[PDB]
RNA sequence: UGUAAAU
């Protein structure tokens, strides 16, 4: 901080004016100081004259090096977002020029600004507040090589990608979807704490749900094409995504969403079917199996139930079947529990048994009787476990009301 | 008895 701005104690004087700081040439010193930046942040919220704006624009977003220094500063990045705000609100000669100079500045340092904890906020800010056409150009400056992977898995830059997906039309970031759907990129990105969220956010935006009813038919066709490209790669690696600690949320999201029903059905038929006993014993994939049971259309649900009740050869030495294994397994027990809940919801009217006017109630009753007969015969061993007690108590409650 | 984001 420059000595002319301090008092008898080395403290910043009160009663300082904005134009004093602007005229002094020491704005950069105030902007990286906590107290000075607080003053500037508050001062620029007032009624500024045209010349005060002129000085602000030139000293904060006028020169690349000072812009970058402020954008990557723990305090300056806030002043940068404020000045960009004022710039967007000031409809003078320079309105588009300032945006383009700003777009060019960020474009030239795009990777490093995304990876920076503070500059990545300046980027997200510009993406959603700048004129859409300039914001779209900013998206094009994203790298196309291994840096884009590093961006998706970064603790800070992953939010830049999610911001792009939220506020930019799909045409401008289609290359990200094709990048992500590249098989080797997909595995790295989905299997990461941050990148998993990136892929889920992409899929959500690519879904024709109620939040996309405002799209044109032409935008829906483009959306559907990107969705199919991404879904093809995902379903091709579905088993390894379903069993990964971070990617399993992606399979769950596809399976649980009615507006992705055809992709749900393809995952169930091509990935989980004939693997239910194995995947039910997996820490992460057992969550995927539950969602499949909960959301499967009735014909696939019947096939999944029949795979558990009668798809596996009993153990040759003891005669234990798949149900025996799963009911006592550390993860499989939640799947049986889910199966029991579905059947009880059906008989008790809390679940639709008609699918297209055709009633499958008889089938739910069949599955419930199988679960009840097993639980009744194994009640003593099952009473030793919480999951077992839960099943026993769910059953007794049910037929004392029906 | 069972898992996830940065001023």
Author numbering: 168 to 569
Task: Provide the publication's sentences verbatim.
PUF proteins, named for PUM (Pumilio) and FBF (fem-3 binding factor), are an exemplary system for understanding the divergence of RNA recognition within eukaryotic RNA-binding protein families. Eight PUM repeats are arranged in a crescent shape with the RNA bound on the concave face of the protein. Each repeat contributes a trio of amino acid residues, termed a tripartite recognition motif (TRM), that directly contact the opposing RNA base. FBF recognizes a 9-nt motif, 5´-UGURNNAUA-3´, whereas PUF-8 binds an 8-nt sequence, 5´-UGUANAUA-3´.
The variant bears an SS/Y TRM at repeat R5, and this imparted the ability to bind to the 8-nt PBE RNA. We found that the FBF-2 variant with an SS/Y TRM preferentially bound to the PBE versus the FBE. To understand how variation of the FBF-2 R5 TRM converts binding preference to an 8-nt PBE RNA, we determined a crystal structure of the R5 SS/Y variant in complex with a PBE RNA and found that the Y364 residue in the R5 TRM stacks between bases A4 and A5, which positions FBF-2’s PUM repeat R5 opposite a single RNA base, A4. In a manner similar to PUM1, Y364 of the the SS/Y variant occupies the space of the middle base of the triple stack, which allows interactions of repeats R5 and R4 with bases 4 and 5, respectively. The two serine side chains (S363 and S367) contact the A4 base. S363 forms a van der Waals interaction at the C2 position, and S367 interacts via a water molecule at the N1 position. FBF-2 R5 SS/Y retained the same overall curvature in complex with an 8-nt as wildtype FBF-2 in complex with a 9-nt RNA. We conclude that the change in identity of the TRM residues is sufficient for the transformation of binding site length specificity. Additionally, the crystal structure of the SS/Y variant bound to the PRE showed poor density for the 8th nucleotide. FBF-2 R5 SS/Y bound equally well to either an A or G at position 4, similar to WT FBF-2, and the R5 AS/Y variant accommodated A4, G4 or U4.
